[PDB]
């Protein structure tokens, strides 16, 4: 069976903006995708993006790295790539629908245990080093985007943020080696269990996704 994959940018926000703006922006982003092939990728997959830089030797500039996070709504979708170059980690926030992008190539379609793995700033450099000249990995559709269960180490405290707080809900961090039982018990004082059973702060966009899927199919058949 084939599972439908809707890109994160097509999901409109929770605000009360008029849907006509979202329709126009979806039409424009589909017309942009008609020329620029934006492939399928999730949080943690490794990509290579080609940008048009005027001040380089060649007009094209390649950058390969792991996707940190993707966020936005419509034509303003952004995704952050992380890569360690000669010991100095570098993060670049690319825009999906930018005209200066020449080519996007997913070299390893792979998910991870966390939807927003911003903790790579505090992780060890071994998990941010990636070979720029790596070869693209082709997988079969029946693999269903295998989720990589990789427990990541951590640099000593302090960290960039408080990844131990329940507001992040992170599983990809190996806490039993870096934090103590007292710290774990203290970090639970900021837990809000009622936000999971609130039943009202959720965003249900089933019919919205259905309409967007129908519109995308119509644009493809056009």
């Amino acid at each position: 069976p084939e599972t439908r994959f809707l890109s994160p940018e097509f999901i409109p926000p929770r605000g009360r903006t008029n849907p006509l703006k979202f329709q126009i922006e979806r039409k424009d982003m589909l017309e942009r995708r008609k020329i620029l092939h934006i492939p399928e990728f999730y949080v943690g997959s490794i990509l290579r993006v080609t940008t048009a830089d005027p001040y380089a030797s060649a007009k094209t500039s390649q950058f390969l790295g792991i996707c940190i996070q993707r966020s936005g709504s419509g034509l303003g979708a952004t995704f952050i790539l992380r890569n360690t170059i000669e010991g100095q980690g570098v993060e670049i926030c690319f825009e999906l629908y930018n005209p200066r992008i020449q080519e996007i190539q997913v070299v390893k379609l792979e998910k991870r245990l966390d939807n927003s793995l911003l903790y790579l700033r505090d992780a060890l450099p071994e998990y941010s080093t990636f070979d720029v000249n790596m070869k693209p990995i082709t997988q079969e559709f029946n693999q269903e985007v295998p989720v990589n269960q990789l427990k990541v180490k951590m640099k000593p405290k302090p960290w960039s943020k408080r990844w131990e707080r329940p507001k992040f809900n992170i599983k990809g961090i190996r806490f039993d080696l870096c934090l103590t039982e007292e710290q774990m018990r203290e970090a639970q004082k900021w837990s809000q269990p009622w936000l999971e059973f609130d039943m009202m702060r959720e965003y249900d966009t089933s019919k919205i996704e259905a309409a967007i899927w129908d519109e995308i199919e119509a644009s493809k058949n056009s």
């Binding site: 009360r16 922006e25 007009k59």
Partner: protein
């Protein structure tokens, strides 16, 4: 006689309320369809463009914000203004309004009849149009007058132009001085007692009073503000959307008065544009779906690269 209050739903029935809604809805639809072709019924004599002439504006609805990339690689931020319904309600003569320039009254989007008073409803009945939400006045010259009751389209402006935008900003209510005027507060914890956000001294000693121009906490946000010199990039004809560069004062889904830029640098730019307004019946030709500027990177682009 202590007469009570009465609304339009109190005395109606379950079988009459939908009938009334439909009877007003199809009436408004028929009126907007009859007023859809103004150039064939009785248009006023179109005067030629003059160097010291001005043009009427529009009243649109601020939808939201979007990015827009230019061919040079730069990225600007545009705001979408939807021209839902722009109708010339009444025309006040120059001598009767200002003595220098004539005045045109423009109405915004359609609203319900069941919440307007008797005088406004009588005016709109004598005009033949449904009531409008926001009613604005535009000061134009005596040669760009239009007959009242004529609809206006977002094609009134062409890709590449400077305009002005007037609207009520986001009213933040009675706010403190630090948020209103930007006064700095006192230090947080070096001993200050009940003074973390106070404005401090408000005047001097020998004056024995405060001056009328003293900045103090008060109402903030709900006021008519105008931004000048906003460039328009893209004009959508199908949905009547205008892409105005920069920030537009006013919350989303609000009415916004658009007019030609009265800046001295763009005073004589109305020469190539349609002088009275955009008449779709005069040219007998349908404009493209999206009128792009000479620098806007269109959605269908070859992914330009530098050379």
């Amino acid at each position: 006689h202590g007469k009570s209050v009465t609304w339009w739903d109190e005395h109606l029935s379950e079988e009459n309320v939908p009938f009334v809604k439909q009877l007003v809805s199809d009436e408004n639809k028929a009126q907007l369809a009859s007023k859809l072709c103004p150039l064939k019924d009785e248009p006023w004599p179109i005067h030629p463009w003059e160097p010291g002439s001005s043009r009427v504006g529009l009243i649109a609805l601020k939808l939201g914000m979007m990015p827009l990339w230019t061919k040079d690689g730069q990225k600007h931020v545009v705001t979408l203004l939807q021209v839902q319904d722009c109708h010339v309600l009444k025309y006040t003569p120059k001598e009767n309004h200002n003595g220098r320039m004539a005045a045109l009254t423009v109405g915004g989007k359609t609203v319900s009849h069941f919440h307007k008073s008797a005088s406004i409803l009588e005016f709109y009945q004598e005009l033949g149009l449904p009531p409008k939400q926001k009613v604005k006045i535009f000061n134009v010259t005596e040669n760009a007058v239009i007959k009242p009751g004529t609809p206006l389209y977002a094609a009134h402006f062409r890709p590449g132009q400077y305009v002005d935008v007037t609207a009520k900003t986001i009213g933040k209510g009675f706010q403190g001085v630090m948020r209103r005027w930007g006064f700095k507060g006192q230090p947080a914890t070096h001993g200050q007692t009940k003074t973390h956000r106070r404005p401090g001294a408000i005047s001097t000693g020998d004056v024995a009073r405060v001056w009328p121009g003293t900045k103090m906490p008060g109402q903030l946000g709900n006021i008519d503000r105008t931004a000048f010199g906003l460039k328009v990039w893209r004009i959508n004809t199908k949905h009547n959307i205008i892409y105005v560069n920069g920030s537009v004062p006013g919350h989303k889904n609000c009415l916004v008065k658009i007019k030609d830029s009265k800046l001295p640098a763009y005073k004589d730019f109305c020469k190539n544009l349609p002088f009275p307004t955009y008449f779709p019946d005069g040219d007998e030709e349908a404009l493209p779906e999206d009128l792009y500027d000479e620098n806007v990177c269109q959605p269908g682009a070859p992914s330009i690269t530098f050379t």
